[PDB]
């Protein structure tokens, strides 16, 4: 009864509508298995949040570029900033590695053992590394504002909005990648261009995307 990703057909078995963003879309039944499905839930959450990060930073930097603030174009920005500063690329990379490794490992072994990460074996903290749900580590740290601990209904709505904006951000960053891969320019530039002539600024005008 809930709006299917494809109106008219019935949803699959392992897809029901229990999690936000469920429109019955697994034409390949990858989630036939509960463990794998739940894992995929967490993976989609993580990737969507990352894409949200990506889109936000990109759009900010691109505004700073187009308006005369001297902000580099994102795909150049990493090189240009490492050059403008006296930083060592491998050092940056390895410290970043350390950090992401530790935190992501904590998350990994929490997925393994649901609650062993809040035992207080860490320095002095307890339940502040206790996941509220799979992919939902709602605690005092991952929810100091405590949105999860009030109005579970509006909270579910927020989950809906979260996964929504997350899939949107994923497709958005892919889009940006494509815009640069095509035009060699800034996505905001190409935007203003399509603004100039929607009739004549598009992939069909690029002739590259559609090769005719």
């Amino acid at each position: 009864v809930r709006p299917v990703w494809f109106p008219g057909n019935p949803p699959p078995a392992h897809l029901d509508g229990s999690l936000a963003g469920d429109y019955g879309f697994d034409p390949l039944f990858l989630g036939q298995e509960p463990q794998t499905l739940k894992w995929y839930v967490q993976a989609e959450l993580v990737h969507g949040r990352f894409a949200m990060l990506g889109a936000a930073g990109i759009i900010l930097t691109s505004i700073g570029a187009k308006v005369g603030l001297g902000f580099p174009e994102w795909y150049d920005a990493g090189k240009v900033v490492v050059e403008k500063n006296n930083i060592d690329f491998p050092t940056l990379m390895v410290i970043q590695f350390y950090l992401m490794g530790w935190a992501e490992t904590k998350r990994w072994y929490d997925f393994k053992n649901p609650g062993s990460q809040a035992d207080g074996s860490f320095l002095g903290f307890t339940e502040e590394f206790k996941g509220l749900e799979n992919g939902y580590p709602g605690g005092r740290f991952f929810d100091p504002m405590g949105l999860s601990r009030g109005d579970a209904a509006k909270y579910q709505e927020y989950k809906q909005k979260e996964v929504k904006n997350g899939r949107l951000a994923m497709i958005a960053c892919l889009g940006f990648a494509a815009q640069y891969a095509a035009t060699g320019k800034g996505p905001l530039d190409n935007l203003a261009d399509h603004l100039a002539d929607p009739n004549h600024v598009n992939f069909a005008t690029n002739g590259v995307s559609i090769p005719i």
């Binding site: 709006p3 299917v4 109106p7 008219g8 009739n199 598009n202 069909a204 005008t205 559609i210 005719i212």
Partner: protein, 202 residues
Amino acid sequence: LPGDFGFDPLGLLDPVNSGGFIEPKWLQYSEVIHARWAMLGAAGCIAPEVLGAAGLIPDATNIKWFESGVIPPAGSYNGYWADPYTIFFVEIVAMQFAELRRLQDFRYPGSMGQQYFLGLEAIFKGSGDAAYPGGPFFNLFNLGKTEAAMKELKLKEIKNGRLAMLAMLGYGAQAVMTGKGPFQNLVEHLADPVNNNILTNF
């Protein structure tokens, strides 16, 4: 049933062991589908030429139909507000939606009037028959509230559509042979039913 003059030599209407899309329902469905298409195609190809013949339309218009640009080798028109492919793109997505939901009916009747579709779902109950939905839209006016006149309209539709299909065949064949407008050919064969014929064009 309408348009059945017993004209099935090879006996394709055989019900036993049917299946796939060899099945009377889908068969006549496609029949009337293509028939309506051909009606529209006749109107489309014929309009602009006679329209310019009346001069009520500009001469930038009224180029021969095939010279539109659908086959650029056959010639294209320019003055179109956008690109050929530009138009073609949105055209694709639109017809995708239309045909898809029509098929969703044909496979699951009435099953396009339940998921929220902007209030246009009572419109999408149609009936228990493809090619004949009706509904408030697909039957604006209750034309044929009696079944006699209903089947009358049905037969008229069938005859008109099959004939229009034949007309499209003729249009294509002549425009290939003489490379001129069908209206051109009409004017010609009227100038000479004797000297303006397919025999002349050899």
